[PDB]
Amino acid sequence: AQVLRGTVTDFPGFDERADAETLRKAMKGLGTDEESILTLLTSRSNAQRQEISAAFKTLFGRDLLDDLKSELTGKFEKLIVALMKPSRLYDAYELKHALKGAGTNEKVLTEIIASRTPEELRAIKQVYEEEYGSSLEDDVVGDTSGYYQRMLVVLLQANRDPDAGIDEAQVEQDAQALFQAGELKWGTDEEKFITIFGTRSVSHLRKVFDKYMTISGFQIEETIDRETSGNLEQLLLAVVKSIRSIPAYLAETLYYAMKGAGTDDHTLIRVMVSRSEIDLFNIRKEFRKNFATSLYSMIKGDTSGDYKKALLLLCGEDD
Numbered sequence: 001a002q003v004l005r006g007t008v009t010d011f012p013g014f015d016e017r018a019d020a021e022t023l024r025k026a027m028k029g030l031g032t033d034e035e036s037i038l039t040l041l042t043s044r045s046n047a048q049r050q051e052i053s054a055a056f057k058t059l060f061g062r063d064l065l066d067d068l069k070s071e072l073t074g075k076f077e078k079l080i081v082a083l084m085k086p087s088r089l090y091d092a093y094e095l096k097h098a099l100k101g102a103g104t105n106e107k108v109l110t111e112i113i114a115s116r117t118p119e120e121l122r123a124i125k126q127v128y129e130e131e132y133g134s135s136l137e138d139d140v141v142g143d144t145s146g147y148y149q150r151m152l153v154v155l156l157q158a159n160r161d162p163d164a165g166i167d168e169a170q171v172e173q174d175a176q177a178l179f180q181a182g183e184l185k186w187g188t189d190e191e192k193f194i195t196i197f198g199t200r201s202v203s204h205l206r207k208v209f210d211k212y213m214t215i216s217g218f219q220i221e222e223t224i225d226r227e228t229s230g231n232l233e234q235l236l237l238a239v240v241k242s243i244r245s246i247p248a249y250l251a252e253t254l255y256y257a258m259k260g261a262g263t264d265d266h267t268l269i270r271v272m273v274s275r276s277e278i279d280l281f282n283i284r285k286e287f288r289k290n291f292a293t294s295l296y297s298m299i300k301g302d303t304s305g306d307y308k309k310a311l312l313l314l315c316g317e318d319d
């Protein structure tokens with residue numbers, strides 16, 4: 001399919017001492033030059049941002065991060081601070097920040113654990129432990145319940161079959177189980193639908209989604225309802241949608257985060273930063289295709305200020 005790319009890449013002919021001085025010049029004295037800051041950081045890669053941060057410290061004896069936290073304000077500050085976080089630690093940080101006793105944010109839990117590949121989930125599990133000194137499963141387990149928690153664990157095991165010629169018997173039989181499960185409202189034999197959804201391979205599972213509607217008339221997603229359903233049905237839907245296309249799922253997330261009154265700035269920030277160098281371009285295409293409107297335009301009509309200016313640049317084009 002389309003090759004996978006972000007909207008941010010290495011700045012060619014990058015100078016971390018020159019960068020560091022531009023940034024210093026933009027904060028030194030009363031006031032701030034927010035346009036210099038947002039225009040520089042937005043067109044430097046995460047790796048480069050970290051390099052500048054280091055040149056900052058060596059040529060001025062100050063911490064780049066703190067200076068930005070005292071110079072900057074609001075949603076704008078939140079966006080730049082996110083941009084500066086090492087890409088290796090970003091996903092674990094967000095997981096960690098969501099797991100909070102009874103205040104736990106399941107939406108974030110669902111969204112990162114359902115759209116990340118095994119390779120990515122394994123790395124997040126290594127990093128999390130290193131940083132917060134505890135394993136991710138234990139924290140998930142301690143702050144979640146029911147088959148929701150059980151399915152989070154199966155997926156965290158980052159262990160789903162590799163692709164191979166499909167076994168067409170297994171597909172019909174597997175489409176059958178899921179049909180019945182839907183009928184009984186996803187609240188019986190969880191152990192059975194759970195092994196199917198988190199262990200079968202992506203190609204096998206795309207065949208199954210196909211058999212299911214032949215053998216049922218509607219698409220799996222129509223048996224779940226993304227507004228009222230529980231934790232578990234919400235996970236089931238994210239999983240089905242991410243199987244079909246990660247960029248299509250992240251594009252929908254961005255859409256419901258702006259769609260309406262206000263904006264879910266947290267969600268908009270978390271998806272734009274995190275995917276800027278992976279698939280933001282692809283998310284842009286799906287978005288446009290599926291919502292009949294460019295992402296660039298929705299952001300432009302939902303945000304304002306330097307917050308808006310930096311997000312339009314990360315977006316980096318009108319589709």
Ligand SMILES: [Ca+2]
Pocket residue numbers: 026027028029030031032071
């Ligand atoms: Ca200043």
Ligand SMILES: [Ca+2]
Pocket residue numbers: 257258259260261262263302
């Ligand atoms: Ca809105």
